Design a protein around this nucleic acid. Structure first.
Lengths: 262, 37, 206, 143, 100
RNA sequence: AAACUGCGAAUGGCUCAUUAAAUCAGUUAUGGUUCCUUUGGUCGCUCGACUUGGAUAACUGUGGUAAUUCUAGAGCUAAUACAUGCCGACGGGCGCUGACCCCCUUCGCGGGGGGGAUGCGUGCAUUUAUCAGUGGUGACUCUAGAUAACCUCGGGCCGAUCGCACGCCCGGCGGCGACGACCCAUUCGAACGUCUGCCCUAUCAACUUUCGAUGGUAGUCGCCGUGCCUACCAUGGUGACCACGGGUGACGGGGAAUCAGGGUUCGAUUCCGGAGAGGGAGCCUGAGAAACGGCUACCACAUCCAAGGAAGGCAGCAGGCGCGCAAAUU
């Protein structure tokens, strides 16, 4: 191509959207925004595939242009707006609030949060910058340039912003024994305490993470997010709790739940 | 907003500088204990 | 047009390439500025990304820096003397980066004579008849004459610059790219640099 | 001794014409725990493409090889021998890729056969993308 | 004043092209004898010289200074300006108004 | 309605001609670059008009040519078009300057320490030189800081813009937006590089090199890195581990067919990446094109013609001819 691409093919769409094969040639190409193309979940796919409030993508145009949807504290009217990790979708006329947390499989799930929980969100910082007059700058994983932050906050720490004001309230520092949601790679959706940092000058630093059933696993430090100091998370967690039961144990629990229920 | 947030950071940077200056005294106090060891 | 392509030319091995695509845009050459010494003519060029780039074609002044005591002034460029790249870009007086140009001294001589209050240049025998900078050499207060005296104690300039300030023309090294930014900024040659470039101008002379 | 070009050779950072009444030398640690040599710091050479005393940063790949030619000036040809696995004939074949690599004149005593470590950087020339980081001397050759 | 007209093959005159015959020109946006279609389009139209000879269809003429007599076709007919000023400051200049 | 303005038209679609370390794949880099948009920052940080200027189109009206999505002359009239530009914050800080003046020691000169009229500058961006060593990396000639300046007349920013509901206050002051904008970050990318990997061929064994071959130095150009291109030096670079040249009924890959274990063959073809729009070439506009449902030539073929000229690009969807063993509805 001799400029930017404006279409996304249904087949070339990321697997974690769980778009079917047969409905359309094209997938909703996420608009440019805070989250990456292959790490986001467009508003349309949340609004008509996950929750099924719409039937078509013209229904999603009617929902969003009534201004009933409010992603992380501000009303958007774009059907292909990239809503990503830790974002809070507040559908206000229904009186509902959803956090985009990764399920134990790599998808984003329908995680309903309370109106009090929906007022703050947790943001991993990407870099520390010194602005034009000695002004310290954070940049979060969702492109928030927050200036005059606490000096103890360094890269790979998470900060708790209040949506309404956009100012930091608390922060977890990247230290051992802290909870870690894995937000990239094979372990996408795991939750466990950080047990080891392994430095690599030049190459990528890897981080071993012990789980709530002693299931230790590694991950590239790029693909890591700290969700609470020690063993207490600062968010509410979906069922499975990022523990990742095996396919043999999944089969066992699904079979036990079906036979016992009736 | 510029003046208030600059004044708010000035108070927070002063606090962190005084706690990191207490850590300067603490490292000099460790050096004082090893010199009196 | 005139291309900046890596594909038009042989490999390590000496094997010629068959070209797989026709000249791209971003693989671009624009004709050389070859900027001269004359009344300021600078042509703005649109470049990649809708950003601007100033082709100086004539340029007669420049913000040159006298790095010894860290002063810089807008000074007239009068002659190109030496170019290390091509010997024929001296006859055709083309300003490029790392040219050796004669510039005016009088902004630096003015600064020196106002800051140090000592007669610099000024061939021995003559006076200043307007009596302006003659009065700016004299008539200070108690403690500020002492400030000028403490400054005067360590105010020695090199005999090489003393000679060049006397003729009224310093040697300067162009540091900016007048083809690109449209400016002819640089620094004044001193110490080993000046001795080196005076030796190279002397060797080229005969 | 030095400065044999038509232009004046110097380090760009260090300023050498401060008013008076030995020139100071710019260097840096290259990173990756590779020690800056003595001859880089104490030496009088001036090389824009030295990874210790020049305008070049080592990033990405660190490789090695054997110095095979030293006839180019300020740059050498090394030779990387490896084994490619043809899976049909469940065996290896001996294959080589000789690459032109820049040789910083801080490495004053280098002979052909010496196992040199090289660091990926920005392209210094048409065919050079690698600076020499350290030289380990050949098997024996203490004399 | 001779404002210039059309060739006998219909090709327009062009202000300061400085021939009498038909000449082909690159015409970009901000030229006579051409309107663009795409932005920065620049077609090769053929125009007629500004020097005037018998080889023409029309000459567009503009009466600058009115003569002695009243011409029956033009001057006897009185037509007012179709529209009136819109911007307030042009109204202020026309009616010779104040700022108060 | 039209017309101006803005935006899009660089995606999508089609085809596989070219292309054999090229393309492409995994793998890294961008500390070597650009980036409309989106998202979040910034947007009284500079110390020096209660809203300015005059064109133009639709419109109206005279037309020309055989002819085109050809346009000309005349009468008007809009801006978030093109232009020009102030008030406010604003009262003063900070660097020099430096009149004047104060206090102490000395017989005094002298020594030594404070206030200070006036004038010159000062914000971010651009460009150069210097000095010191807030935050960050494995490492910057990084970020930030300070000094000195410079400021492209073909000219960086600091808002002469529009809409909703409108109120409180002895004319001032205010909510919710839309649009625009320097710069930073983010996103979508794109570009150029790293390591490794390709079919047949020796009836191709030496090739590359003063029309750059491999290096070095300094420039030019470029968005940046680099023989990319100059000038001057050096004589290098590649090769039996198959260079160089040639062929390909060769776009590459994910993949497909067969297949015990190995393999063999295919992959024009819906996804990814590349390339091209009859052949080469050149450029306009734009964030993005060397664009062809953009423009300018040449070569080829071909269409209207009142013979003066004008117009073209189905490897888009249909469809026609031709070609064929071989492929569908204007």
């Amino acid at each position: 191509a001799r400029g930017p691409k404006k279409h996304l093919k249904r087949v070339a769409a990321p697997k974690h959207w769980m778009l079917d094969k047969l409905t359309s040639v094209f997938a909703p190409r996420p608009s440019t925004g805070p989250h990456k193309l292959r790490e986001c979940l467009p508003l349309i796919i949340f609004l008509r595939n996950k929750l099924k409030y719409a039937l078509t993508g013209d229904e999603v145009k009617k929902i969003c242009m009534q201004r009933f949807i409010k992603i992380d504290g501000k009303v958007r009217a774009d059907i292909t707006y990239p809503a990503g990790f830790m974002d809070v979708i507040s559908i206000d006329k229904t009186g509902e609030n959803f956090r985009l947390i990764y399920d134990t499989k790599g998808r984003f799930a329908v995680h309903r949060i309370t109106p009090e929980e929906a007022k703050y969100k947790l943001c991993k910082v990407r870099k520390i910058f010194v602005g034009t007059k000695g002004i310290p700058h954070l940049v979060t994983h969702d492109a928030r340039t927050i200036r005059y932050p606490d000096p103890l906050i360094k890269m790979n720490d998470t900060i708790q912003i209040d949506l309404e004001t956009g100012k930091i309230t608390d922060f977890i520092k990247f230290d051992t024994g802290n909870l870690c949601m894995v937000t990239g790679g094979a372990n996408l959706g795991r939750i466990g305490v950080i047990t080891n940092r392994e430095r690599h000058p030049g190459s990528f630093d890897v981080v071993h993470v012990k789980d709530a059933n002693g299931n230790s696993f590694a991950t590239r430090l790029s693909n890591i997010f700290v969700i609470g100091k020690g063993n207490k998370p600062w968010i509410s967690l979906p069922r499975g709790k990022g523990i990742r039961l095996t396919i043999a144990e999944e089969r066992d629990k699904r079979l036990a739940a079906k036979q016992s229920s009736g | 907003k510029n003046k208030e947030e600059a004044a708010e950071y000035a108070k927070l940077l002063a606090k962190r500088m005084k706690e990191a200056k207490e850590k300067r005294q603490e490292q000099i106090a460790k050096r004082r204990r090893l010199s009196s060891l | 047009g005139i291309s900046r392509d890596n594909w038009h030319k042989r490999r390590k091995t000496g094997g010629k390439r068959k070209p797989y695509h026709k000249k791209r845009k971003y693989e671009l050459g624009r004709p050389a500025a070859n900027t001269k010494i004359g009344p300021r003519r600078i042509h703005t060029v649109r470049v990649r990304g809708g950003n601007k780039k100033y082709r100086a074609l004539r340029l007669d002044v420049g913000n040159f820096s006298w790095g010894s005591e860290c002063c810089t002034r807008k000074t007239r460029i009068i002659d190109v003397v030496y170019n290390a790249s091509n010997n024929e870009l001296v006859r055709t007086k083309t300003l490029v980066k790392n040219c050796i140009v004669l510039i005016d001294s009088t902004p630096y001589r003015q600064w020196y004579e106002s800051h140090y209050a000592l007669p610099l240049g000024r061939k021995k025998g003559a006076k200043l008849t307007p009596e302006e900078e003659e009065i700016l050499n004299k008539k200070r207060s108690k403690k500020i004459q002492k400030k000028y005296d403490e400054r005067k104690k360590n105010a020695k300039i090199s005999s090489l610059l003393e000679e060049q300030f006397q003729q009224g023309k310093l040697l300067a090294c162009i540091a900016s790219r007048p083809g690109q930014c449209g400016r002819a900024d640089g620094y004044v040659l001193e110490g080993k640099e000046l001795e080196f470039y005076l030796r190279k101008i002397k060797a080229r002379k005969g | 001794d030095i400065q044999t070009e038509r232009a004046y050779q110097k380090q760009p950072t260090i300023f050498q014409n401060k008013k008076r009444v030995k020139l100071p030398r710019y260097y840096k640690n290259i990173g990756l725990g590779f020690k800056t040599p003595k001859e880089a710091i104490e030496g009088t050479y001036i090389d824009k493409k030295c990874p210790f005393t020049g305008n070049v940063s080592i990033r990405g790949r660190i490789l090695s090889g054997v110095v095979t030619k030293m006839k180019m000036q300020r740059t050498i040809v090394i030779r990387r021998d490896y084994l490619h696995y043809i899976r049909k004939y469940n065996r290896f074949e001996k294959r080589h890729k000789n690459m032109s690599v820049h040789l910083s004149p801080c490495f004053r005593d280098v002979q052909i056969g010496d196992i040199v470590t090289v660091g990926e950087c920005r392209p210094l020339s048409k065919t050079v993308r690698f600076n020499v980081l350290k030289v380990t001397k050949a098997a024996g050759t203490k004399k | 004043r001779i404002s210039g007209g059309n060739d006998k093959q219909g090709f327009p005159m062009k202000q300061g092209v400085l021939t009498h015959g038909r000449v082909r020109l690159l015409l970009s946006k901000g030229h006579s004898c051409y309107r663009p279609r795409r932005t920065g389009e620049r077609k090769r139209k053929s125009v007629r010289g500004c020097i005037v000879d018998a080889n023409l269809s029309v000459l567009n003429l503009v009466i600058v200074k009115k003569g002695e007599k009243d011409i029956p076709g033009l001057t006897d007919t009185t037509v007012p300006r179709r529209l009136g000023p819109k911007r307030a400051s042009r109204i202020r200049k026309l009616f010779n108004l104040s700022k108060e």
